[PDB]
Design a protein around this ligand. Structure first.
Ligand code: GTP
Ligand code: GTP
Ligand code: GDP
Ligand code: GDP
Ligand code: MG
Ligand code: MG
Lengths: 134, 18, 41, 429, 429, 445, 427
């Protein structure tokens, strides 16, 4: 929503004040991420992970909030548009993370094999005739 | 109270015939 | 066009006939030895 | 200073109030996002000092699926984000549920928002409650809401626009229980109760309008137009202005008898209005035609005891008088002996607005007729027959006793409606 | 949010539920990896009813898979749609029940209930407002019958206010798969009338009948019958997941359908069923849908309703439609054959409408109907039971587990009481 | 001339001050270095910072605060944070080992070795002030140094500074939500200090601010920071008349004059009126009647009590922003009509108003919207007894079988403290119900 | 600032402390040489809790390594992180105790307790403010169960008002490792009852169940078990070394979780334990951490909470969370399971929240539970003791070092009295 040709100032597009809808913040399942993307490397901060967050992003977030959301005044208008320099850092081989990894693991085991060390859920015990754990 | 409205002030419960 | 233009507040107002005071709107017209003071209708 | 708080309870209330507030926004200057693109809006809309108008309504429902469409679609911007009250579960077609178990933990929020709406009100004329008898929250929570509204505010007039269960068609099985039990409570906490029926509106939409295959939206648009005609004289000037308190003085002869009808006369399509003159004499006859009423009860079997006529548009009192006399002189319509006048008139200059995409036409004349007859007693008799037919074997009572209710409630409500039923016989004779 | 916890049980339960989760993921646009790829925004806001939230925007189904042998668990886990399920939700044992109700209910199946209970309490306490449960099983097996009933009679007293549905597959009269199945059928039917709120009776040869004459399917494998069951398994909870003109959840179909706490056996149906050769030669209209719902060849239980009386009829419609040609058609079907509806309930019809159809279909409708013609299934199961029990045919496979021999006698007595209770409520004036 | 010395004791006091002093540094033009770039203020008289700030010899502003804690894990955050250069290094007192949720340790063992330095810093702070209005103590009841060392501090402050006014903004244990087990012992034993060595004690429930944040604001899952911002706004509103100009200025002595009927009754209730998000301020306006009616609702209260069951004895209304006295008069005349707000019989007026012309200041990354008006009702009600009634039950349940008393008696405390404190709270309950009984006759027949 | 002098005695103590110091050095950013190679300023702000500032810009651990036989110290010195420990802290004898409590307490531990007390007197008085001591040992061995209790009995005389912790490995129900283990267990519990402020009981097949069922580890070595014990060991003191919204040291937990001075046997736990293939099927979130915190398949002692009543429960959280969610979860778990909590304490949960999580984790938590279900372990050990002691089974290996049988009688009497006193609060 920060891209508009008619609101270009010094080569950067900016978002006007008349395009902000007040109901967008209470929309949990409209602006959401679906899949995302994995990388075949070790965890860490790198150049190919897209939503990788360093210690320079939280300082920028605290700075922009204390900078009044990057207002752009105009002639005969106190505040006209919102500067696009405050949302640049939320704008963007690699594999999919959502394909399941359990299919290449071991088979699930029956319950008595899982009960090899301490016994849980036996009918002939004290705890079967007590109130369970909710 | 019996079956039809008798002389005497009271609530007219019409299905119970009372 | 959507983007018309931000006009600066300076031009397009001043060359009129009179004084046009600000605190109390009064329109002093001063001809040669004549005066006609008006106000806001 | 002439404000009217609307309350919409249940799915029927919400789906009526959507069309109602669409018509309200079009009639005044209010954009769908609450902006302006001249004080008529103050009855229905409030004011903020930034150009934003907020409706004086509450959308209350227990299931979330009906209200969540309101806060998603076009008019999501118009309503306050809190004014759409929503529960977790529903009453599940159970008066007992929505009146004793689930509706108890919701009524505090609705009462608080009603109080906050009334704090903005200085000239509060009354309330407008929309619900349906055949549901659970439209019968249980609506009864509890009015029942505590009477203790909250007192003698303030609360008007009812209830969807009465139809004689022939029905959407439920347990609805005689709910309709028995809520009229035991909408007798002492409702100043008036305008009744509507779904199948009569189906027949009206089939015959008068060109629309075969009509959805519920076409049903709700007519109720929106009628309820705009009810409060039209508050917002616009007229030759003879009527108030909300001017209704019940001339329409309700006894406090037990407050169930009048509603009738929008020039229900006509755009193609058919191009050939029909819709003068006062031609549309006053359509009000008293039994085929054009919106309740499936025939006034030929009963007698009129009051008649309230509210006209819209360029109506001269000439034609109004000359057509009411014509209505009087024909003997298909008959009146009771103890009313020799039997008419109340009202004229507003402002014509009814048209909704785009609706099936109504642009008309310069419209009259909304309110009248209570003794012919509504057959509806009570039929609903009575259905109850005592189903209550003999106690066909569904276990779904009511286990949710906070007894055996004797059905019996005492049933003999109360026996008193209501043949209280009409002493009036019509 | 009103979320359903799904409970598979045994081979029948797993083979039905795999296809059920397939159609649910088809309707909501969920790939086997577990993400969302739907073409509309109407498929996501009500996904919490069946899908739990995992990390990374992954939707895991709300299912626990129960079996007493690892034969079917390993097959459904290696299937194309087997990777959506949580790995911990697979709970199975080593030694099967061996088509024994007693092994599944008392000795072998009792070993496993305390882990399925752990998974169920794991899953139900993560619910915010849990609506109810859902069990799929068969009454002719050993762990669908015994273990499923133990789950039914063990999660009911922990959660004594929810809505419990069972999509049970009662034994067919003619085609048979298990010799000992009358014992399991009787001993599970005796227990299914105390701890359930809704029970859907499905016969395999009724589905074969549907496939062989209605669908014209020639080699129907178990997948086609699974789709026939699962289409109406998803046609009942459809109003929670999608908006509509008239919504009805499980409880709204519970209060409106069962008159007494021991009459909760219905016969499902699915309206728009046609062959592939008759795909284009059909106009999908409401008069073509209700006519097929009430046809005697459409119910999935092999009990002809013409031998009995319809106590209550429910119908859930899907797809964009209005409410005139629904209610007029249901009135017509109530008035045409009025001898098959009980006179002591004047309106036997419940109707709901949702406007989101299944993909590839303009309109669809699901029939749920409570009939007293279900007594001919019970009495014939009882006849085949008593042709076996008087000679003690297979009682040593049941007595040898500590089950007292009187249990069969009281199960038969309760079954006969059910048949007689259905018989009295038929001719009742 | 109108100075006010803030004392923050404990972890809760320090984290409350970390938001209160950011709010104070934003209301006046104070950079975190300590600079005032512009001497002119938009609503004050070029010395408005003298209530909270003092000048140095290098053109710098230093807060009149003392941060006290018996452990340094939260004070070193102040020493390393954004405002590291604003505070004097000596103004942030620290200890070696905390009291570890033990009133006895912070009152008898650990607090004795650090109280002299804190009193020294308080003396050197009050030396500079020539017009000291009073103190503002910030602590919490469910702790060892917020309940034990604060008691010792107030006991020495009362005998050192005489009848100088002091106010505490304490945190009270919630009815259902708690973060400590031994918390009722500390909350009971500190009642004698807030009853004896106090002038106006404020009680604040964390749970009630949790309902306010989740309901009025759109913030689900709040933290302690969002809780502390509201308390900072309230203490800013209670002192805004000593700094800025308004129609009806009210000092801290008129407060206790018009709010405290008896010397043993000094427990009013706090609520902030226009606590709404920027989402919901777009639809509704914020008229004086709206934010006067909303202050009387039980959900808007900042403790878990119901004021409908009790009766108001006094009320103090503090107004900020676009407020003209005509609107306050209209709102008060409106709220005298209704049956719900029932006052006591011996207070026919029962209202004290105060109007300031400065709208409240927002913080970057804050929760509250920027508003034109703000009200802070500060009223005493007989409905505050239902917190002491809930606390006495827990103390009686614990002490009836003598559960945790061994951690207390072996740390120097005589074990008879618990019985005497319970008797004191019972006497307080009886005294609070004695001033609520109507002095009328109950009709006849 | 607040200083912990870590002691370890025995093979179990040494092999647990090796992984403990590995985990601490990973968390504080210490390379195997000893220096700092971390990437944060918070890792150095309270590093003197476990480390000493010394020559090289490097930090040496405050570890006192004690064993009667240097057999297992050879393995830790040859490990990757064996070069950090000071050579003076290794205290060792010549002959092992041979799983005998009497040799580790009277004959061979007596000659070695002088040098250990010299080392701990040096390490404890190089502190600005010593908080307390820390012992890792086992109740089944010979030099652990004797030498560690001798060290506690000698240290509590010198430093009485300090905090002593014991992360003892208590004997295992099903399969034991030492035949004479009940004697050592009873004789060491008799000392730990009167000598220890906070005791942590860890069972070995509880950890085997964890590694087999929760983590799905096919081939787990003892490194994973020591890793789990180290993870729950570092979580108790995580608020001493890192900031947070609500901080709690050892003394705060000692005050809150110990009602009466003889109930300090806790059951540790670690919340985000998830199998490899089940990692993407569940989310890290406060309800889904506190559910696994209270689960019976997560305790490190082999006795479920359902056998008794929960007396007091700790919960130390790490990460970026909201306090309202935490304090509503701990209230909800008390409300739902109302029969398993003691009714005479209105709040049975003490909550603390830290700032920095472990590396690679969003959230973490450390369950510490004081329950009356631990009394069934002491009953089991006591009856095994009576079965052994009725016929004087292995008693000649204890009287041969000069022990009286009244010691065994009194050590079982103390255990019986503590069992009967735990049973007092069952109702
Ligand atoms: N005229 C009209 N009637 C409606 C409309 N929507 C629903 N109804 C009526 O509502 C009845 C169904 O019950 P509902 O009112 O929806 O029930 P509810 O108010 O949602 O309360 P619950 O039963 O608990 O769900 C039907 O018999 C209809 O007559 C509508 O849009 N217009
Ligand atoms: N509203 C609010 N309450 C807090 C905050 N921090 C702590 N608390 C409360 O304070 C209690 C914690 O104990 P404290 O009194 O802070 O502990 P302390 O003052 O440091 O005393 P010791 O811990 O013994 O040194 C909890 O019950 C919280 O309710 C905070 O930042 N905001
Ligand atoms: N109708 C139908 N029946 C099935 C299906 N799968 C199995 N069955 C039936 O289940 C009955 C026996 O169930 P069984 O497999 O023994 O249940 P179990 O106890 O879990 O092993 C047989 O009559 C089969 O016809 C299916 O997909 N549809
Ligand atoms: N759980 C666990 N137990 C251990 C470990 N190392 C040793 N043990 C225990 O140590 C006991 C054996 O005695 P040990 O300590 O080796 O003898 P000691 O060195 O003379 O004290 C057994 O009870 C084992 O359970 C370990 O790494 N994990
Ligand atoms: Mg509804
Ligand atoms: Mg502290």
């Amino acid at each position: 929503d920060f891209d508009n040709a008619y609101f270009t100032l010094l080569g950067v597009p900016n978002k006007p004040l008349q395009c902000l809808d007040i109901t967008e913040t209470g929309q949990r399942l409209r602006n959401r991420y679906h899949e995302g993307k994995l990388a075949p490397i070790a965890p860490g901060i790198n150049r190919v992970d897209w939503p990788c967050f360093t210690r320079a992003i939280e300082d920028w977030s605290r700075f922009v909030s204390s900078a009044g959301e990057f207002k752009l005044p105009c002639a005969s208008k106190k505040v006209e548009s919102f500067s696009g320099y405050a949302v640049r850092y939320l704008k963007p081989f690699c594999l999919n993370q959502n394909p399941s990894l359990d299919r290449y693991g071991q088979k699930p085991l029956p319950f008595d094999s899982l009960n090899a060390f301490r016994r849980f859920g036996s009918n002939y015990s004290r705890v079967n005739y007590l109130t369970p754990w909710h | 109270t019996m079956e039809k409205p008798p002389p005497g002030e009271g609530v007219t419960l019409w299905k119970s015939k009372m | 066009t959507p983007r018309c233009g931000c006009v600066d507040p300076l031009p397009g107002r001043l060359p009129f006939q009179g004084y046009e005071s600000a605190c109390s709107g009064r329109h002093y017209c001063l001809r040669g030895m004549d005066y006609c003071v008006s106000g806001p209708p | 200073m002439r404000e009217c708080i609307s309350i919409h309870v249940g799915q029927a209330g919400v789906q009526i109030g959507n069309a109602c507030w669409e018509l309200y926004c079009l009639e005044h200057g209010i954009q769908p996002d609450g902006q302006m693109p001249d004080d008529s809006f103050n009855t229905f809309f409030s004011e903020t000092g930034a150009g934003k108008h907020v409706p004086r309504a509450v959308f209350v429902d227990l299931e979330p699926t009906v209200v969540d469409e309101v806060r998603t679609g076009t008019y999501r911007q118009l309503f306050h984000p809190e004014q759409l009250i929503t529960g977790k579960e529903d009453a599940a077609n159970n008066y007992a549920r929505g009146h004793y178990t689930i509706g108890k933990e919701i009524v505090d929020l609705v009462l608080d928002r009603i109080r906050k709406l009334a704090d903005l009100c200085t000239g509060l004329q009354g309330f407008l409650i929309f619900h349906s008898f055949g549901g659970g929250t439209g019968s249980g929570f609506a009864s509890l809401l009015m029942e505590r509204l009477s203790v909250d505010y007192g003698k303030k007039s609360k008007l009812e626009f209830a969807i009465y269960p139809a004689p022939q068609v029905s959407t439920a099985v347990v609805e005689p229980y709910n309709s028995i039990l809520t009229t035991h409570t909408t007798l002492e906490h409702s100043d008036c109760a305008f009744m509507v029926d779904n199948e009569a509106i189906y027949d009206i939409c089939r015959r008068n309008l060109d629309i075969e295959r009509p959805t519920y939206t076409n049903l709700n648009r007519l109720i929106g137009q009628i309820v705009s005609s009810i409060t039209a004289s508050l917002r616009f000037d007229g030759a003879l202005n009527v108030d909300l308190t001017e209704f019940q003085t001339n329409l309700v002869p006894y406090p037990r008898i407050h169930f009048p009808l509603a009738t929008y006369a020039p229900v006509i399509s755009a193609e058919k209005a191009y050939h029909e003159q819709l003068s006062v004499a031609e549309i006053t006859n359509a009000c008293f035609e039994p085929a054009n009423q919106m309740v499936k009860c025939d006034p030929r079997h009963g007698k009129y005891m009051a008649c309230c006529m509210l006209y819209r548009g360029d109506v001269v009192p000439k034609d109004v008088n000359a057509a009411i006399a014509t209505i009087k002189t024909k003997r298909t319509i008959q009146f009771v002996d103890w009313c020799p006048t039997g008419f109340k008139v009202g004229i507003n200059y402002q014509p009814p607005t048209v909704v785009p995409g609706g099936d109504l036409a642009k008309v310069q004349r419209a009259v909304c007729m309110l009248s209570n007859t003794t012919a509504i007693a057959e509806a009570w008799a039929r609903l009575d027959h259905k109850l005592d037919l189903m209550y003999a074997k106690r066909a569904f009572v276990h779904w009511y006793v286990g949710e906070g209710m007894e055996e004797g409630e059905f019996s005492e409500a049933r003999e109360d409606l026996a008193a209501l039923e043949k209280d009409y016989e002493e009036v019509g004779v | 949010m009103r979320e359903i916890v799904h409970l598979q049980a045994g081979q029948c339960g797993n083979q039905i539920g795999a296809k059920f989760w397939e159609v649910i993921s088809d309707e909501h646009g969920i790939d086997p990896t577990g993400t969302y790829h739907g073409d509309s925004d109407l498929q996501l806001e009500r996904i919490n009813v069946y899908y739990n939230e995992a990390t990374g925007g992954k939707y895991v189904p709300r299912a626990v898979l129960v079996d007493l042998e690892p034969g079917t668990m390993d097959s459904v886990r290696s299937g194309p749609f087997g990777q959506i399920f949580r790995p911990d939700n697979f709970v199975f044992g080593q030694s099967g029940a061996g088509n024994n109700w007693a092994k599944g209910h008392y000795t072998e199946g009792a070993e496993l209930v305390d882990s399925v209970l752990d998974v169920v309490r794991k899953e139900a306490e993560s619910c915010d407002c849990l609506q109810g449960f859902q069990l799929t099983h068969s009454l002719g097996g050993g762990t669908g019958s015994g273990m499923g009933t133990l789950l039914i009679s063990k999660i009911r007293e922990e959660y004594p206010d929810r809505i419990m549905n069972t999509f049970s597959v009662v034994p067919s009269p003619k085609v048979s798969d298990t010799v000992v199945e009358p014992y399991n059928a009787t001993l599970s039917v005796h227990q299914l009338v105390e701890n359930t709120d809704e029970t859907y009776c499905i016969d395999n040869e009724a589905l074969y009948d549907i496939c062989f004459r209605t669908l014209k399917l020639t080699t129907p494998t178990y997948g086609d019958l699974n789709h026939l069951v699962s289409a109406t398994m998803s046609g009942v909870t459809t109003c929670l997941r999608f908006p509509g003109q008239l919504n009805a959840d499980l409880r709204k179909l519970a209060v409106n359908m069962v008159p007494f706490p021991r009459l909760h056996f219905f016969m499902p149906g699915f309206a728009p069923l046609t062959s592939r050769g008759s795909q284009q030669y059909r106009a999908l209209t409401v008069p073509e849908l209700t006519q097929q719902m009430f046809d005697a060849k459409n119910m999935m239980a092999a009990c002809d309703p013409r031998h009995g009386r319809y106590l209550t009829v429910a119908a859930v419609f899907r797809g964009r439609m209005s409410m005139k040609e629904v209610d007029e058609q249901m009135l017509n079907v109530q008035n045409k054959n009025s001898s098959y509806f009980v006179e002591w309930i004047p309106n036997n019809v419940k109707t709901a409408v949702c406007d989101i159809p299944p993909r590839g279909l303009k309109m669809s409708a699901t029939f749920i109907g409570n009939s007293t013609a279900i007594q001919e299934l019970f009495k014939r199961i009882s006849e085949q039971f008593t042709a076996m029990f008087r000679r003690k045919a297979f009682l040593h496979w049941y007595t040898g587990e500590g089950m007292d021999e009187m249990e069969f006698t009281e199960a038969e007595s309760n079954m006969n009481d059910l048949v007689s209770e259905y018989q009295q409520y038929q001719d009742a004036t």
